[PDB]
């Protein structure tokens, strides 16, 4: 009913390749000495459905990988060769793009020193940007740290351009808006959520004349002050993470460390329209969350949104091995579909939403859920 596999090395983070279509079936475990890649194989020999994990190889970097994200530049070809590009955060506060053929690293691009972070780096994301036609114009790496900075690292055909933006407190989570890679979301420790357009200053003002500046900080949403409608006394909680909801980034989910979560339905759930059909006739609304609740358990890692169903997210009790599945909608019906009896290190959804991958201290798991 669920697959399990032991680990020889202590893990920190787990992520699915969803950015590359041909590699959509592999899992990376960031661990003490590098990055092990696993393959999700559909095969189950007795004659049934049921996935398994095959430990492919380990990229040795010589130091802990704490956060990690697959690039789209990841590909498979035929000796069979996995050609990988990995955006990594490492123990030395560096942000890296690691380029491999299987285990072997051809090149690491490292952001450190003066231009990098000068404290713990909490989150990282990568996004693809397309030019006039559908050509691949730029790849962008965003990172946030305890140094209260957001760093944007643009990998252009010409080379690297980077910029840093101050934050009001530590930056604990960052994510590019799905289907809109020019916007990103940043969650600060103090609960302030910021939507940021890294793009609108370079196109008109930064590169040339006539230097008429626009504010790239589009919106601040407040989290902590707006909780209590469910329902926390929460004596000084902080933000665990903030995530875009929907394949178009139409919604926003914030999770506090206390378990208190909040949802905004900002944009239309649609490829084209930004303004939601809902806004169009009931009038302009305020920026209060649309719905909120509180998880059964405090949430160290934050919410893990379902990659397909908007209303569903998973949140874990990391210390006790419980994962609660929450439907936002759906008020006060409590479901804990997974209980392990041991700590959780990290977990993520299978790229297709059928399974959850979970790293514990001694093993990695695949668990299917239906509905």
């Amino acid at each position: 009913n669920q697959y399990q596999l032991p680990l020889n090395v202590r893990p920190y983070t787990t992520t699915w390749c969803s950015q590359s279509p041909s590699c959509s079936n592999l899992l990376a475990i960031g661990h003490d000495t590098g990055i092990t890649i696993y393959c999700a194989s559909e095969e189950q020999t007795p004659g049934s459905t049921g996935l398994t994990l095959q430990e492919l190889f380990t990229i040795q970097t010589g130091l802990p990988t704490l956060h990690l994200s697959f690039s789209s530049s990841c590909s498979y070809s035929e000796s069979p060769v996995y050609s990988l590009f990995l955006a990594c955060v490492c123990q030395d506060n560096t942000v890296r793009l690691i380029i491999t053929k299987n285990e072997t690293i051809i090149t690491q691009h490292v952001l450190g020193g003066k231009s990098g972070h000068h404290n713990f780096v909490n989150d990282i994301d990568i996004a693809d940007v397309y030019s006039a036609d559908n050509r691949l114009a730029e790849q962008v790496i965003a990172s946030v740290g305890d140094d209260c900075t957001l760093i944007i690292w643009r990998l252009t055909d010409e080379g690297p351009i980077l910029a840093g933006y101050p934050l009001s407190s530590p930056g604990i989570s960052v994510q590019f808006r799905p289907s809109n890679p020019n916007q990103l979301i940043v969650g600060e420790r103090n609960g302030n959520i910021r939507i940021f357009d890294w793009t609108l200053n370079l196109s008109a003002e930064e590169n040339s004349q006539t230097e008429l500046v626009k504010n790239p900080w589009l919106l601040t949403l407040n989290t902590l002050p707006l909780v209590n409608t469910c329902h926390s006394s929460g004596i000084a909680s902080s933000l665990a993470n903030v995530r875009w909801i929907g394949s178009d980034g139409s919604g926003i989910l914030a999770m506090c460390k206390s378990g208190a979560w909040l949802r905004w339905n900002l944009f239309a759930n649609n490829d084209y329209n930004e303004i939601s059909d809902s806004t169009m006739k009931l009038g302009p609304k305020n920026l209060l969350p649309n719905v909120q609740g509180i998880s059964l358990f405090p949430s160290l890692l934050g919410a893990c949104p379902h990659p397909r169903y908007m209303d569903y997210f998973a949140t874990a009790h990391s210390q006790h091995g419980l994962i609660q599945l929450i439907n936002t909608y759906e008020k006060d019906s409590n479901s804990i579909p997974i209980q392990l009896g041991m700590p959780i290190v990290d977990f993520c959804w299978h790229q297709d939403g059928s399974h959850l991958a979970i790293a514990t201290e001694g093993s990695v798991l695949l668990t299917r859920l239906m509905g």
């Binding site: 900080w217 902590l224 160290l300 001694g362």
Partner: protein
Amino acid sequence: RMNELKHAVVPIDLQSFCLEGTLALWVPALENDSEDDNEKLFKKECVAYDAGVYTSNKSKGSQTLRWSIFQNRTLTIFDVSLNSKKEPLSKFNVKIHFPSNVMKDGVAFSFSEHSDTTIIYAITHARVLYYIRLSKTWFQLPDARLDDDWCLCYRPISFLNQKPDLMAAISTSEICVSFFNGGLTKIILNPKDASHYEQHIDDSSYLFSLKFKADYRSPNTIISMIFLSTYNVLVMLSLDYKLKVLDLSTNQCVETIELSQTILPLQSFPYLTSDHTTNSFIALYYPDNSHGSFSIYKLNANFKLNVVIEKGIIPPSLPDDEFIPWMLSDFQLISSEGSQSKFLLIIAWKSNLNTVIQKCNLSLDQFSCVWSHSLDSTFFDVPTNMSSGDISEIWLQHIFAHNTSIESIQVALLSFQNSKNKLDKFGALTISELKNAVLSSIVSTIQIEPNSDLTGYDYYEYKRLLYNEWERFAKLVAYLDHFGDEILSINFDPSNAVTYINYANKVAFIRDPYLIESFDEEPLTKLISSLETDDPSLIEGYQILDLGRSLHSCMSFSTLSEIRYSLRELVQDLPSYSLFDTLWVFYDKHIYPNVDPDYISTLIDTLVSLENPMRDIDSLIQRLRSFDIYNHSAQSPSLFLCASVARVLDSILKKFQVSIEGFIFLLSLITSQQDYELQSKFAGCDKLFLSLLEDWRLVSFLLENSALLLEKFTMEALASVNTALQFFSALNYSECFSESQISPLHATVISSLSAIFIRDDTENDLVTELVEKLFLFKQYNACMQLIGWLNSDPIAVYLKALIYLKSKEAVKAVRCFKTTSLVLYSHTSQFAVLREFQEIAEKYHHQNLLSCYYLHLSKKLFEESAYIDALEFSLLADASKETDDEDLSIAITHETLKTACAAG
């Protein structure tokens, strides 16, 4: 030359006094008891129409109590003691409800030596006299026990026909009450049977020395009276300007003097006061066309008593704009005990909601008058960077750190919704809940709109409308709260060194400005005119300071916010570039784009013209940070002291930060100039710059402590205080041991400032010290908020690890644990966080210290149920031994078992 007086203001609300609640009391009910909108609600409930502070000067030690009366038929009492007691902290105030409004001048205090209890006499508009016994318990313990006899009610017969006007407590059982239309009674109570009688006083002024309607006032009507001791004597002033001495032993007038003639009505204020040291001198006020004058009289007793003159006129200086009127509110008199030649007269002036305080040092020639006074009287663009956060964050900070009362925010909050019921509901909100409610209600009213071709929202318009709503709210808050700024009375407290100033919803005290204050508020000319001098580098240093001030003022709020983020980065990650690369980058990003080319040239040229400018500012910078040190005290400060110190510190630290920044800006400008002679004149300025960065750090650190709200679950104040800066204030609690005439308030401030600026190699870091104490008091959130200020010393890094550990940040904790060691700290006494490590170090004879550290870590990760790391550190302890110790070996393998088993 005229010295400036400043004050420290504390709002009279539960939050500002660090109180947990209010004891609510109702006086026993009797038969004939008897008896736009939001602005009137505030005024009725929160704006006192009379107030004062009474000191029970003979107890162990003195209690100092501030009373206020409101048009909601209440009398509130707050403990405002500045001295340390042998007593539990005042965590509560008392609110006494009446069936009718207490009358103006209708509250009088007295203190009994035996039974150690304070008494309040109160008379209401309904003319009931109340005799209230105060228990110290009421201030200390929640839901305190009421003695049955706490309130006695009296209906004096003389009150039936005559209107009570002024009071003077004679004792714990005797009080005098004068009547509006003339006359004077002595009410004598027998507290042990609830009965009383009166004595008709005949104002028997046989001789005086010299050289029709039903509504009507007699010439003997008392318009001002004061009680003195140990002369059993009453001093009264009459409607027809007679200064009378009433002998209370015999109830006869012993002496009378006719004073000069002018129209005195119809403004109502005190005319008489006596000095607090030897009840022997009397100050007396004479109205004029232009502010009046003051007299002093000596009282001489042999039976017969003489009121002999000492002064005909003490003329006040000009209050500011004399085409609007100024009225005397109150005044005090203080003689200096050494002996009867030096006097001090403090005067409070009123003009609607405006106020001036004046001091006069008067002395005898066998006269000279040295005068001082108080010169008492926000915007930002939409943030384009997030260094100080966004619109709501900034406005919320500003409103809650403004020194306005909590009530004004609560009442303002009502208006921004849909109620006397609702005000009381907000009173059961915590301060954080209040903050959230304010933000929530503003954010809920502001709507975001689509724009323009329906391709996104109009983010720009949202920002502007959100800003304006916050602004309106802030204006309403300030507008309501400003009614609470009306002056009402002043009181010299001889027990402390302090003169209290009583506003309609705030208490304050007088203080001298520190140098930093003088240098902050303008202008250069007035600064120079400080005598004589008459030389550089004194003048020249001042000139350069002004250059720093004016450079600072080139920066907008938004630029300043970016600069402080850069300076924070500079002092939290000091290694990156060389010293002079950082100054250059700093100048390039923050100064150059903000400062005009001519203005740069102007600074260069005026700096070159100075003979040794670097030495000059070096010396001035030395002056500004120079502070005496008072004796550190044992033991507990009052909460009110901590609150008072914190407010003054916050105010001083802001001026320090702006000052330090100006110099940093100046140094950064200079070292980026291609002018040989300028830079030659500043050749070794790196040590000066580093010194300023260190000052900036500590100052900015403490400023972050000012708004940092602490969590709620010997030195008792440390656990009951409300802010991180009040906690800091308590740790630096200090007294002047040799001299009484200095209050623990001034000593604590000065000591705190000393701890900030007086430096050396040997000392520990102030951040580590403060954060370490917060940690010991389980203020984990505060610590975590402040963690970026802790430096790279091993103790600091170890403490970073403990804080992360407590904040469920295991991976960050472990990383910090492995980049530091306690190997050099097995003996250190100062930090109690080191005890667990040091117990292990002592057990194993301060040998194999690395292993001891790893053993300690193992046991520590174990308590927090981090069993994998607890195991690894145990294995590390085993691997790290350098010297044979069987006891240590055994203890380690013991721990390995214990840890491996728990991890599986």
